[PDB]
Write a protein that binds this ligand. Sequence first.
Ligand code: NAG
Ligand code: MG
Length: 208
Amino acid sequence: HYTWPRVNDGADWQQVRKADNWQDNGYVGDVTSPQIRCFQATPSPAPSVLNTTAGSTVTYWANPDVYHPGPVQFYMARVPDGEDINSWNGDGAVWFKVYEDHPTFGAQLTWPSTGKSSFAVPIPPCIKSGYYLLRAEQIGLHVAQSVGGAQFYISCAQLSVTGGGSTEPPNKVAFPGAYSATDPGILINIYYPVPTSYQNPGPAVFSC
Ligand SMILES: *[C@@H]1O[C@H](CO)[C@@H](O)[C@H](O)[C@H]1NC(C)=O
Ligand SMILES: [Mg+2]
């Protein structure tokens, strides 16, 4: 139970759209729900936008910290030139993955997110300048052995990216759309037999 309330030095939900779990630190359990995108049943803009450059790092904060076992992933989606970040919600197949982590394998799986509040998100240097939504996700897998058991902790930040390139990420995905409840990284027993591989849900990480 954690929120993703802040980016860089900003306050709770300042550059981050106010997630539906802002009070209860709850989760999304339905990968087909509109909440799977930005944890908002009804889209509502953040009051501010974070300025950053392509190639820089954005810090995404979890609160209190990430403590359920499972992967952290970040996605981005570009607002079209003729659109306002405050009213654009990332409909359709517009999302590309910019970060994912992987567990280490042994008698038990260890996760490179556990106990952390601060997460380094690489903004790709080669993507087009413009406004973006940045989606934060952690997938709690501690009760994910049953269908609908995975717990998604999500939010989306509003970015203005400058100094970009011209590379368009291929195979963009939709939320909902990208995930199925039976995906091997979503419907999974992490405890027995302990996995020796782990397949992150969604498309491949985009790289320049
Ligand atoms: C962010 O960039 C915008 C232009 O899109 C500018 O008006 C604004 O002052 C900048 N904000 C900060 C905090 O630098
Ligand atoms: Mg919890």
